[PDB]
Design a protein around this ligand. Structure first.
Ligand SMILES: *C(=N)N1CC[C@H](C(=O)Nc2nc3c(s2)CN(C(=O)CN[NH2+]N)CC3)C1
Length: 188
């Protein structure tokens, strides 16, 4: 059976941090559901790219569980994820079932808001570090991608391919990740 990913898309999401993981995971044969936090209507991203979700989060929640739940960043997008009781319930269920949660740039601040993965080693964008580290609920990392068990974090648009390929490796293994990486023309 193909692995499955849920990507939660909120208004103000960083569109690169959304699209790069969706595209890379789909290249790996993962069945990705781009789920709109606000419903199936189009979502205006941080730099005004408008993405049409595959489903509402309400409907996508019904079709779990998922092998990974992915939280893009964006200042407003991560704020919206952080304020959502629906996101809180999905992340708590994913943590409880020992499923992977992956968040990039400002996205990890939604882990803090929902009390997910406390005591984990995490990274964030530098500009989100102080927010993430308020209260000392995590240990901080400067690694471009940090994987501490089932909590996978990363730093920014420029780490999005590394982040996505780490998700692919976690779900589908090293060889699939190498296959997907091969034609991307990534540096090293
Ligand atoms: C990646 N998706 N990024 C990196 C730059 C963008 C971002 O994180 N911008 C931020 N603006 C604020 C953040 S993060 C956190 N912040 C505070 O530290 C306020 N007090 N806090 N505990 C507010 C503004 C998106």
């Amino acid at each position: 059976a193909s692995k499955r990913a849920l990507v939660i898309l909120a208004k103000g999401a960083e569109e690169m941090e959304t699209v790069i993981p969706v595209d890379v995971m789909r290249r790996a044969g993962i069945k990705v559901t781009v789920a709109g936090l606000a419903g199936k209507d189009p979502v205006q991203c941080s730099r005004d790219v408008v993405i049409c979700p595959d489903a509402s989060l309400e409907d996508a929640k019904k079709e779990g569980p998922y092998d990974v739940v992915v939280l893009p960043g964006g200042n407003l997008g991560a704020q919206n994820l952080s304020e959502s009781a629906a996101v809180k319930e999905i992340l708590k269920e994913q943590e409880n079932r020992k499923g992977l949660i992956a968040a990039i740039c400002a996205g990890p601040t939604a882990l803090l808001a929902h009390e997910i993965g406390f005591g984990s080693k995490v990274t964030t964008h530098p500009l989100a570090k102080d927010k993430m580290m308020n209260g000392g609920h995590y240990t901080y990392s400067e690694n471009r991608v940090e994987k501490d068990g089932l909590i996978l974090t990363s730093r920014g648009p420029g780490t999005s391919f590394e982040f996505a390929l780490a998700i692919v490796e976690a779900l589908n293994g090293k060889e699939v990740a190498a296959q997907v990486k091969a034609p991307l023309v990534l540096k090293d």
